[PDB]
Amino acid sequence: VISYKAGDYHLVPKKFTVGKRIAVRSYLDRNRTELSDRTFMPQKNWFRPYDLQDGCFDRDHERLSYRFYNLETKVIWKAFDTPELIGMLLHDETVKGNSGMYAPDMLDAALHYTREARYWRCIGITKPFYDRNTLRAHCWEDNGLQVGTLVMSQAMRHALMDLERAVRRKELGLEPNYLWDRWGPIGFIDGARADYLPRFEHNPYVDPDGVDVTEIDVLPFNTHEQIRERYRDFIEPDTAPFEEVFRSPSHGSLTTLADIPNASVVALYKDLKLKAGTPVAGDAVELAPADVRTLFYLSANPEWRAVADGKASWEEVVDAMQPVQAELDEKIDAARLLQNTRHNAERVRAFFEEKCGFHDFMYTPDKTITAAVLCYLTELRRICTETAWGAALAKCLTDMERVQGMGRDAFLVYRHIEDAILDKKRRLWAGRFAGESHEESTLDYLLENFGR
Amino acid sequence: VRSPDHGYSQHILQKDIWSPFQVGANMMSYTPLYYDWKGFSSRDYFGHRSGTNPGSKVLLGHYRRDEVRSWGYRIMVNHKPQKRIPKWLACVVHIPRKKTFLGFFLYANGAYVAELLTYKQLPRIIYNKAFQGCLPTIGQTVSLTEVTYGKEIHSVEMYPGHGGVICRASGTAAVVLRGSEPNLVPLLLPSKEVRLFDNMCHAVFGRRAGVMYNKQRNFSKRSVEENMPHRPKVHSKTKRVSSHPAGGGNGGSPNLLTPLDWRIHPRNCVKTKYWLSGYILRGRQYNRNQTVADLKSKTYSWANRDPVY
Amino acid sequence: CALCHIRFRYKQDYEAHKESELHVNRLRWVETMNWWRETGEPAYLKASNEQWEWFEQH
Amino acid sequence: VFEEETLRERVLDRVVEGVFRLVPTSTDRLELKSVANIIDFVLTHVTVARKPLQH
RNA sequence: CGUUUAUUAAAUGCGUCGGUCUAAGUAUUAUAUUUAAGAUUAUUCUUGUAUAUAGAUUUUUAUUUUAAU
Incomplete structure (x- = not known):
């Protein structure tokens, strides 16, 4: 048998209905108080699925007639409007699946237009x-x-x-x-x-x-x-004063008292700098010279190399018996080069702040900027064309495939440089929102205390 | 600061509410928060300046004009603060026409968008963080579960997650009432009518803002009454007897027995509640005469809601 | 008196309601309906069965 | 709302790059700033992955 | 301090107040009115409209409307 007590199926799901009868909803029952989360939380989006359009490119010309009509022509534009984000879309078109975005040709046209x-x-x-x-x-x-x-x-x-x-x-x-x-x-x-x-x-x-x-x-x-x-x-534009700063370790954010082990390695850097010829201890959190700072990153991530040279009881030995990973500081500086100037319109402008010394990017005249871009694309080509690890590294987007090709240990390195850069931002953001003094009372007293 | 709200009083009668801390007009109009629209005046479908047909709640008050000025300050308001992410009151902006105060909160994951500003809030302080207590800090947006009996909350949301609708006006506050219902909390809305608010609803703790609006705001200047521009509200007793039944009479006729706007508004007759919600417990009519305090004494359950209305 | 949708304005009739011709009659009606459901119906359609199945076999 | 860069990078390298090994473009990283949108961005680029059912 | 076809104790207008409204707008708010700001005060009493009402009428005055010979 099939039991049924009546008053069961309403014929309409119980949401769209009154006891019986579907109910009416007409954007006048609704308030405007919903839909007011839009001021911060943005509306839903339709993210288009990324396509390597080769399925649409059954033959040759239609594939090399959008290289210009769609890819190059988006560079001539970006080489005109904002030449600093000209490395951003080079990522945007290669995350979308295109082939020759970092090819030895697209750049040597991107730098051509950017120049002219x-x-x-x-x-x-x-x-x-x-x-x-x-x-x-x-x-x-x-x-x-x-x-x-x-x-x-x-x-x-x-x-x-x-x-x-x-x-x-x-x-x-x-x-x-x-x-x-x-x-x-x-x-x-x-x-x-x-x-x-x-x-x-x-x-x-x-x-x-x-x-x-x-x-x-x-x-x-x-x-x-x-x-x-x-x-x-x-x-x-003038390219002399910027000629080689992208091929050099510079971490505008990172301070001497900032390291993944915040004390242990810098205790060594104070230990080496008191038993030294020309010894100077560290209380001044003032930034040390650029190249010696990237040494500790090459000496603070791997507890291999943290102890490998911590044993060394002299100044220059630690400072100079590690040139072997100083032959590795470019393969990481090629990474902190790409992923810095890549993702958002902001990461790039913050990047140029460190290297080419733009105090504020937003006020540096275009003559000073187009140069730095011209001196930055001129060294993207070096990375793509000169050395073999440059191509794949460019076309790598995730870390999983990034770690593979180039130095697995070299990627252990800067992902504690980037994690150290961002953690400095953690100091600024969460720095604002940690001072709690509110109450029913002390918010009253904070008036008179504000009176004088 | 003396008294974060002042009855500034430019002319001995003209008392507008200046607040020290009020952001200067320059730091007011914010681009992605500024809405502009023509407000229809009182014209509804076929122009035809007219109120609303008797049974409806979509207001086109007959006497309305210049609702959106066009170069008046008009930033949009959040009404949905987020639960427990710290705020940061950056400034306190005061729009005259929308009498509300509202201050820009950073909200600690970049969202320079939040407005409703509870009374006794200071600028450049962090607010949404709780003290040792549950969430008893002025400005902290609290679910109705976290409040205890007898403490005020403002911008209470009527339906949970559907934005704050109740107690938004300046200096207003919905008082909790300690009901007996399983999962519902009754709040004494300022209209002296109590309502079985869902406990999971979100309210902002504290009074609302800008106390000294209830009175002490009096324009009495022809230019300054353009904070509230409305059409002239003519006598109903000088209206061309062909037009309006109260009319003519060779002198001051007092008026007809049963007053009427055009249809009827007899003095306490036209009470226009037509649908009562399932949450409503006692309308403003069922309490209008008792007191403010006696309604705060009882415990409210479903048996308190009168089976007949 | 939700039974009959009556708000009482005058006291001394809220008392005399329980035996008013409105209440006592609304009492009988909402009761005999219960009677039908409580005993009647489960027995009425009982006999309606016990005669049909009598027919289709006797 | 994952707005401040410090927070987006703290989520995007972990969930959409780490857990899923997806990689979002620049222009989508703009609106990719909420729990609602993070879910959809994945649920398009993983739906465009199932080999089209082969009849 | 505005504004009007025979141009003004005409009608506007701020405040107070009365009523209405917590499922379209914030009940120190917005509708719907009566007055008029400022300063003193704002008295006595009810037969009808309204409200509430209990099959309706008939009855029936917390507040409001109109009334006070």
């Missing part, structure tokens, strides 16, 4: 691409038929005025205060109102030194060639 997109960013170009196909720095002064005479918009012939006015100044011998070298990622670093370029004829840039630049001046500087030599000195 500067000299047509100072020329006044606002969009790097004219149409789907060609670049706007190749619109010739005919319809398309002129040889090299660039179609100079009014913005340009006012960007080429500011350049010419900067030339005449240092041609007068004065200091060439080029306007767009106070121009950074936030606009004028000087906190001034941005001077917008199609400048009104009733707001002409006036320098009380008597420098004349007008339309009669810049009209002959039409084609690409006679500016790359005339304003060579300004459109070109």
